[PDB]
């Protein structure tokens, strides 16, 4: 008709959509078809098992069921409590649970909410990591934090910055903190960090010459 | 059937689900549930989100085209035409959504938009998380030269040439 037809198969009970044998004629096109069909079936299961209301379509995103957020808060403060008591690994497991539950929120629910929650949890777990001196993973988590929330998140920038300088990536740290100051949260801790970085950079290779 | 961003895969899958063909000799339409059709339409909507945001991203990216002669102008007009076509597609998806579930077309692209956003976030996060392993191996190889801090007070016996 006015579109490119694709022969498909349907599994009754399973409700799943299968691709016909070589439906499109191209390995690329066929693989793309297979991945898309995978996403389709996954979405179908999602709609079937995660819509609590009687209408079988996703409710508008802006009024959000606050249960999940509340649980995430609980495990967050659980992690914080385990942090103040200075046993960090447990706090890390808890923070991890928080990230997992936050990232498994239905995709049709507000992504910005996800960004908020995972930004804070990522920053917290990062700090907990750099308490145990495990720098790379901490820098990773802090980077994820900044990726989720770029502005008004100076602590994350700072934390990845110090992680970077701790593992002797001084230039990367310099530029990272430098750009982190352009997006604006509170400044002067990032400023202190930067002054330490470029002072250490001057001192480092004043001794090379 | 002709689009600015390639053949619409999701649209084709939707319309193929609607016009299902004999699965075998039997010439019986293998009845496909309305739930599947709805899911497929939502997928189509997500793809449409990506496409429209791509076009409008172009427009800002490619603005100086208007200052680059008749050829840049012609390209800009191309972009405009593409946008209008895609808007027509969005409308079609909306009224199809309403036809499936009355009123759904008022929120289907809100949900679709959120789905797209979430996907993108997951991807960026995943490359960040993927870097961590080799960052660890690099750090382990680098830290081999750094002096141990536990009771660093006591130092190596310095070399005195005699």
Closest CA to A190 of A177, A179, A209: A177
H-helix segments, A27-110: 27-50, 67-84, 88-103
Distance CA A177, CA A155 (A): 11
Number of H helices, E strands in chain B: 4, 0
Total beta-carbon pairs less than 8 A apart between chain A and chain B: 131
Residues 6 or more apart in contact with residue A158 via CB below 8 angstroms? A177, A180, A189, A190, A193
Q: Is residue B4 part of a domain?
A: no
Q: Is A9 helix (H, G, I), strand (E, B) or coil?
A: strand
Is the Cβ of A60 closer than 8 Å to some Cβ of chain B?
yes
DSSP letter assigned to residue A60: P
Residues 6 or more apart in contact with residue A43 via CB below 8 angstroms? B39, B42, B43
Contact A58 B136 (CB under 8 A): no
**Count of the separate structural domains present in chain B:** 1
Is the backbone of residue A168 left (phi > 0), alpha (psi -120 to 50) or beta?
Answer: left
Distance from B84 to chain A by nearest Cα, in Å?
18
Distance from A78 to chain B by nearest Cα, in Å?
24
Residue pair A44/B35 in contact by the 8 Å Cβ criterion:
yes
Q: In the numeric block, which tokens belong to residue A124?
A: 């917290």
Contact B114 A37 (CB under 8 A): no
Nearest 10 degrees: Cα torsion B112, B114, B118, B120: 70
Q: Which of A1, A36, A43 sits opposite B9 (nearest CB)?
A: A36
Diameter of chain B measured on Cα atoms? 101
Distance CA B41, CA B48 (A): 10
Residue pair A158/A174 in contact by the 8 Å Cβ criterion:
no
Q: Is residue B65 part of a domain?
A: yes
Closest CA to A81 of A98, A102, A67, A100: A98
Distance CA B32, CA A103 (A): 32
Closest CA to A163 of A136, A141, A128: A136
A 160-199 residues inside an 8 A Cβ radius of B: 167-168
Distance from A56 to chain B by nearest Cα, in Å?
8
Residue pair B101/B109 in contact by the 8 Å Cβ criterion:
no
Distance CA B155, CA B147 (A): 10
Q: Kindly tell me the sign of the dihedral angle through the C-alpha atoms of B118, B124, B130, B132.
A: negative
Closest CA to B40 of A16, A47, A40: A40
Q: Is residue B35 part of a domain?
A: yes
Contact list, B50 vs chain A (CB under 8 Å): none
Closest CA to A4 of B1, B36, B17, B40: B1
Q: Is residue B85 part of a domain?
A: yes
Q: Is residue B94 part of a domain?
A: yes
Nearest 10 degrees: Cα torsion A148, B62, B11, B109: 50
Task: Identify the CATH number of the domain in which residue A196 sits.
Answer: 1.25.40.10
Beta carbons within 10 angstroms of residue B113's beta carbon: 21
Q: Is residue B150 part of a domain?
A: no
Q: Dump the DSSP string for A107-140.
A: TTS-HHHHHHHHHHHHHHHHHHHHHTT-HHHHHH
Distance, first Cα to last Cα, chain A: 75
State the structure-solving technique. X-ray
Is the Cβ of A32 closer than 8 Å to some Cβ of chain B?
yes
Q: Is residue B56 part of a domain?
A: yes
| Packing angle of the helix pair A88-103, A111-131 (nearest 10 deg) | 160
Q: Which domain holds residue A187?
A: 66-207
Q: Work out the burial of residue A153: count CB atoms within 10 Å of its CB; fewer than 13 is exposed, 13-18 middle, 19 or more buried.
A: buried
Q: Which domain holds residue B49?
A: 9-113
Contact list, A58 vs chain B (CB under 8 Å): 42, 107, 111
Distance CA B58, CA B96 (A): 28
Residue pair A33/A6 in contact by the 8 Å Cβ criterion:
yes
Q: ∠ CA A135-A137-A141 to the nearest 5 degrees?
A: 115
Q: Which of A10, A109, A143 sits opposite B114 (nearest CB)?
A: A109
Q: Work out the burial of residue A125: count CB atoms within 10 Å of its CB; fewer than 13 is exposed, 13-18 middle, 19 or more buried.
A: buried
Helix (H) or strand (E) holding A19: strand A17-19
Where do we find the tokens 């969005």?
Answer: B90
Residue pair A175/A193 in contact by the 8 Å Cβ criterion:
no
Where do we find the tokens 């690099």?
Answer: B138
Distance CA A186, CA A154 (A): 6
Q: Is residue B138 part of a domain?
A: no
Beta carbons within 10 angstroms of residue B131's beta carbon: 14
Distance from A134 to chain B by nearest Cα, in Å?
9
Distance CA A160, CA A142 (A): 5
Is the backbone of residue A13 left (phi > 0), alpha (psi -120 to 50) or beta?
Answer: left
């Amino acid at each position: 008709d006015t579109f490119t037809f694709i022969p498909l198969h349907i599994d009754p009970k399973s409700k799943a959509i299968s691709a016909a044998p070589n439906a499109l004629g191209t390995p690329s096109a066929n693989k793309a078809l297979e991945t898309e069909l995978a996403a389709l079936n996954a979405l179908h299961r999602a709609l079937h098992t995660q819509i609590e209301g009687p209408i079988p379509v996703p409710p508008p995103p802006v009024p959000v069921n606050p249960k999940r957020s509340a649980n995430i808060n609980k495990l967050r403060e659980s992690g914080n409590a385990e942090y103040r008591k200075q046993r960090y690994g447990d706090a890390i497991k808890l923070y991890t649970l928080g990230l997992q539950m936050a990232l498994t929120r239905p995709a049709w629910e507000p992504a910005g909410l996800v960004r908020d929650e995972i930004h804070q949890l990522y920053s917290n777990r990062a700090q907990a990591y750099m308490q145990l001196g495990q720098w790379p993973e901490a820098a990773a988590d802090a980077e994820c934090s900044v990726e989720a929330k770029r502005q008004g998140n100076a602590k994350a920038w700072y934390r990845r910055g110090k992680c970077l300088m701790e593992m002797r990536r001084l230039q990367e740290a310099r530029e990272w903190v430098a750009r982190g100051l352009e997006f604006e949260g509170e400044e002067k801790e990032l400023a202190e960090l930067l002054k330490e970085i470029d002072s250490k950079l001057a001192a480092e290779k004043a001794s090379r010459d | 059937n002709l689009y600015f961003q390639g053949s619409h895969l999701q649209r084709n899958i939707y319309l193929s689900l609607l016009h299902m063909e004999p699965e075998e000799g039997q010439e019986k339409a293998p009845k496909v549930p309305d739930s599947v059709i709805r899911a497929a339409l939502l997928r189509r909507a997500v793809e449409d989100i990506h496409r429209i945001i791509q076009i409008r991203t172009a427009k800002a990216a490619c603005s100086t085209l208007l200052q680059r002669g008749s050829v840049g102008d012609d390209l800009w007009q191309r972009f405009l035409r593409a946008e209008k076509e895609m808007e027509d597609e969005l409308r079609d998806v909306v009224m199809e959504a309403n036809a499936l579930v009355p009123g759904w077309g008022q929120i289907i692209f809100q949900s679709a938009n959120e789905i797209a956003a979430n996907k993108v976030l997951r991807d960026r996060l995943e490359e960040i998380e993927a870097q961590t392993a080799r960052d660890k191996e690099w750090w382990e190889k680098r830290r081999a030269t750094i002096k141990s801090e536990f009771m660093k007070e006591l130092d190596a016996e310095e070399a005195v040439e005699k």
